[PDB]
Amino acid sequence: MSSLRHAIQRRAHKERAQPLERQRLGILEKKKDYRLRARDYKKKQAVLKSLRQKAAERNEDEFYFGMMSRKGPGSALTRGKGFTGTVDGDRGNKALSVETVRLLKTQD
Amino acid sequence: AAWPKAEDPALVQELLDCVQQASHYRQLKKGANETTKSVNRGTSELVILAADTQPLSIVLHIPLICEEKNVPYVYVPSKVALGRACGVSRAVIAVSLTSNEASDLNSKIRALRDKVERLA
Amino acid sequence: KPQKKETYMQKRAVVVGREERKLRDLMQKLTTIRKEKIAKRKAKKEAQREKLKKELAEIEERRREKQKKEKKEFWEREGKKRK
Amino acid sequence: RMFAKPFLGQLGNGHVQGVYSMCKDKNSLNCIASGSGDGVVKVWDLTTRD
Amino acid sequence: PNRKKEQRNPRVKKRKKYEEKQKKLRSVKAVYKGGEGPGGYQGELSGIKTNLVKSVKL
Amino acid sequence: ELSVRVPQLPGPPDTLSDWYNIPRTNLTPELKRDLQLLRMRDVVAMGKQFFKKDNRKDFVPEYCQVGTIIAGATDGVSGRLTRKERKRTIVEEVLSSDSVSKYKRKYHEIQEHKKSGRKGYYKKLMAARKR
Amino acid sequence: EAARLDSELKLVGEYGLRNKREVWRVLLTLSKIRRAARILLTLDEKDPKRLFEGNALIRRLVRIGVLDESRMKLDYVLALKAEDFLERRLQTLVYKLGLAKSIHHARVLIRQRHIRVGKQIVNVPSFMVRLDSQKHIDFALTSPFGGGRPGRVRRKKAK
Amino acid sequence: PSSMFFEHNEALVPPYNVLVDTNFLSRTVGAKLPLLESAMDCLYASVNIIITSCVMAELEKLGPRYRVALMIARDERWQRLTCDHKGTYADDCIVDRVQKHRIYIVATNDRDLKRRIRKIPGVPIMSVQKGKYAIERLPGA
Amino acid sequence: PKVKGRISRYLANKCSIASRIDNFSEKPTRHFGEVLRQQLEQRLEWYAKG
Amino acid sequence: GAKAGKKVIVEPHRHKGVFVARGGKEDLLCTANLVPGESVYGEKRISVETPTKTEYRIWNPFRSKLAAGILGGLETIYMKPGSKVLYLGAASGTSVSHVADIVGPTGAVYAVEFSHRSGRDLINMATRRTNVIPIVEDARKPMAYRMLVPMVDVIFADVAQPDQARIVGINARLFLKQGGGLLISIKASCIDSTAPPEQVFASEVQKLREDKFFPKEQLTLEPYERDHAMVSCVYLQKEFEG
Ligand SMILES: [Zn+2]
């Protein structure tokens, strides 16, 4: 049980460190750090597998009405060197009319 | 002017005996300013006021705060007897004896303030 | 995309004073200490919640064991009555 | 038949044994009395039935 | 096993158990603990919450 | 005697009729700083004084009014802020008070604990490998 | 049961007792006194047994200072309690008379022989102090709070 | 509530207020056992012993076979707590009363009401155990 | 110093006595204030001997 | 502490007419001042210059059992602005000023004091506030002020008497509307000094129920006063107004 064990039965076992001749390579990854690494990789691969399923089973004739108010991801040919697959969003700025810029420049 | 005046038949001496008991128990504040500060801090359980005071307006000003805080007050007829009962070697005209959560004096306090509430 | 040119609404911005910058820095420091304190309190409460759920699961295991024992005692008494 | 609800109340705690005699006051309007089986009588006032 | 300096004396253990169970009581109910101080009324010193009803609904 | 009337025909309430007309909050940036300070007043007195945990989603109430304690006539020697301490906002009083170094110390401990292993650590590991 | 554990812990904390054996000891003598009071209430009023035995019981409790001198009925003798008995103990009387700073300080003083009850020093903290003997609790003459030698750590320091 | 130190009710000091249920009352008349005398002999203290109108209602709703227990309940020297609710259900009446005020000793004998009032901290349960009464969760007795 | 605060406390005591005497009378008097002013004057003479 | 000159903000409470002024390290309770620019008994008050005449006055819970009950957390206090309040036990008019500041100019507070010098202080503060009328009479005999008190909505009862339930029963039989709110402040050491306070409170609640009230809330206002309770009850109904 738990009362049938001495304090030397309860005593913790220490963890060894990376050798000092090899400490420049980083920390010695043990089971806990390996579990963190494996959890992050399995999570990222699960998201990527779901994205690959969604890109495979895509209707080529789909029509949402946000397509008339968004700029598409395009291709590398149409966009150019600045091509990421992400749809570009708006930063909030807008082209500003001349009367309001006349007001702002009088204030400045 | 002192309408809750204590009468003779073994109520003044019960009051002064409880006063001496509380003064031994260190649960008692002496003098007009200390009675006033104890009533305004609300720790007071009962307050004894002398009635033989040269001009009585001092032990007339204390009952207003006692009636505002609703604590019992009672006049004993001798400030010399009140000082002798406290153990002061001076004449005391106002005595307020406080409350504590654990004592055996509080039974005397409770019976005394029942008699005083019947006196009022 | 992080904008690289400086717009006119960024060029015309007023340089803020010293007292308002001291108030801004104080508000930054207070909001960070508040966020760290809230995260610590939530971690402690989640630890207490998981300990409570462990002990609740142990109590439910004991309840299922006593329920099975009382069920078998009752049906052992009734199976002799229908025999 | 829906609003036929005839029970209104009960005078006090009642008696200990059963009520074997009772009599109203024919001059007043709220004076009742009732004498029980253990020989105790009670005078009730109908305005305060508590 | 190794036991505590508190556990070697049965009075001091029951002193520290009462000090911490009187401390756990203030976190549930409200103790009186003296009225207004000598300084007066410095406000309700730890918050006032408006949408909290703490009365025993009879 | 009897005159031609003036014809005066051309949402949420402005003033509360039941609370003696508290005006609606003019949500200035100073009042917003004051309300953030009031929801973080547990952090301000750093553990010396804990507060009732009132945590709604919006800390700004609908009706407020920024006032000033005038005077208790019984206490006026130490229960009275001096001229060099009567400040404009509440955040200015918190900053003029002490333990701003205590806030900075706790902030730098939090900053070390949050920069503990994120990316400068990995840049240092990569440099020590490449050397 | 949790009610018994919390009640006995309140007694052991509020009066600086050592264990629950002292609580059970007081509860046993209180139950004996209260059983005698119930047996005397069984009889009718103005029976000579109830009259003289109840007067003996009430005079005994008033003389040992538990029952108050105001209330002297056998119903209040039934309404007696263990908080009143532990209040009549000596250790809480030293704490309430203020010779000691806390109840554990009072137990420490009574153990190492500083206070005296009347004439003789008292080594036991559960000494049931009577009402007549309540006033004569003070520091003994051989104690450094009473007089005589300045004491032990004082002697080692003044050498 | 005030006077509650961690499931220890400090509000109950003698004279003990004891609520009586119909099961306890029928069984204490059935066991040839005097009610106030046996309660005082159980607690060694002066009881005042109360019966709600739901309890009197259930004793009256039981037939004329229980007329003796009805007269025993209708003894005059006991307090009658009038109830202001609808159903005349003694269990919920007793539990609501005890949950509000919590100064009472509940005297029952049914295990359903006993398990229902064991959940709330600091109420003793008095039950007749064929020779005398027995008080369950009172620490002073 | 100390004598200034001592005279301040004594003056506060006698001013409290004078305030309650002048207040709680119906139509007040003069001679009790005269007595207390003589007492303050003889104390002003008393502190000079030292 | 809550020093003079600190900036606080003043938000409404859950109750009507009461506000809570919070700021910095101390949140306190206040009511809108009826006569602005003057304190009654030397209390701290709160001036806000609206974008002058607006002032709030701080409500001491250690001095007034109503503010102690509000900070304890009563479900309602029955006194909205414009509701008549009969105050019994209006000793010197300290909390009566805050009740009058709650009920505002269109309400009325009938403050009954028995002693005469407390009556002088009450007549002074009711000279200041024109909606509190002072009645120097014994609250045990409500036939004296039946010309003065019309049928009020709320009764406050802060009398420390052993016959407190009978006093409130006859005063509410004479001057309280059908379904009338009241708050009674029970002090156990003055009701029954020997008995435990929870038993004293249950006995006083039972006496009110015999005197035809229906009790709906009860709190022991413990961090402000020892062995005190505040019982809220409705006269002759179960709901408050109708
Ligand atoms: Zn019922």
For residue H18, the cross-strand partners are H49, H105
Distances (CA, A) of D6 to D1, D2, D3: 11, 11, 9
Q: How many CB atoms lie within 10 A of CB D18?
A: 11
Determined by which method? cryo-EM
CA of H126, closest CA in chain G: separation in Å? 15
**Cα I37 to chain center, whole Å?**
6
> Are J149 and J157 in contact, with CB atoms under 8 Å apart?
no
d(CA J81, CA J109): 11
Distance (Å, whole) CA H129 – CA H107: 12
Block residue for tokens 């039935």: D49
**Nearest one of B116, H11, B104, B9 to J162, comparing CA atoms:** B116
Question: How far does H137 lie from chain G, in Å, by closest CA?
Answer: 7
* φ/ψ (deg, to 5) at E37: -75, -175
Residue A11 structure tokens: 């005593």
Q: Does G16 touch chain B (CB under 8 A)?
A: no
* Total CB pairs under 8 A between chain B and E: 6
Cα–Cα distance measured from residue I29 to residue H64, given in angstroms and rounded to the nearest whole number: 85
Q: Quick check: bond before H15 cis, omega within 30?
A: yes
Query: What is the strand order of the sheet H125-128 is part of?
Result: H79-81, H47-52, H16-20, H104-107, H125-128, H133-135
Q: What is the DSSP letter of E29?
A: S
Q: Are strands J108-113 and J84-88 parallel, antiparallel or unpaired?
A: parallel
The resolution in angstroms reads: 7.1
Residue with tokens 């913790």: A12
Q: Which residues of B touch J121 (CB under 8 A)?
A: 64
Ligand 1 centroid vs H53 CA: distance in angstroms?
Answer: 6
Q: List, edge to edge, every strand of the sheet that includes J84-88.
A: E56-57, J213-219, J228-235, J176-187, J152-157, J84-88, J108-113, J132-136
Nearest C-alpha neighbor of H104 from the set H11, H8, H6: H11
The whole-angstrom separation of Cα H80 and Cα D14 is 11
Cβ <8 Å between J25 and F89? no
- Which chain H residue has its CA at the smallest distance from D40's CA? H76
- J167 CB within 8 Å of a chain E CB: no
Contact check, Cβ <8 Å, E46/F50: yes
CA pair distance H21, H7, nearest whole angstrom: 23
Structure tokens at B23: 């003064």
Of the candidates I23, I46, I22, the one whose C-alpha atom is nearest the C-alpha of residue I34 is I22
Q: What is the dihedral of CA G65, G70, G72, G74, to 10 degrees?
A: -90
Distance (Å, rounded) from C-alpha B8 to C-alpha A98?
A: 101
Separation of alpha carbons A49 and H139, rounded Å: 66
Which chain H residue shows the shortest CA-CA distance from E28? H6
3-class secondary structure, J53? coil
CA–CA distance, A98 with A105 (Å, rounded to integer)? 10
| Position G93, amino acid | L
**F128 near A CB under 8 A:** yes
What is the side-by-side strand order in the sheet with D19-24?
A: D19-24, D31-36, D41-45
Tell me the residues of chain B between 9 and 68 that have a Cβ less than 8 Å away from chain I.
32-33, 55-58, 60-61
- Which class for J144: exposed (0-12), middle (13-18), buried (19 or more C-beta within 10 A)? middle
β-strand pairing of D19-24 with D31-36: antiparallel
Sheet holding B28-30, edge to edge: B28-30, B94-98, B44-50, B73-76
Give the closest of I20, I25, I32 to B61, CB-based. I20
DSSP codes of every residue in D24-38: E-SSSSSEEEEEESS
Query: CB–CB of J71/E48 below 8 Å?
Result: yes
Q: Which two tokens stand for residue C58?
A: 């142990």
With tokens 């207490």, the residue in question is: C48
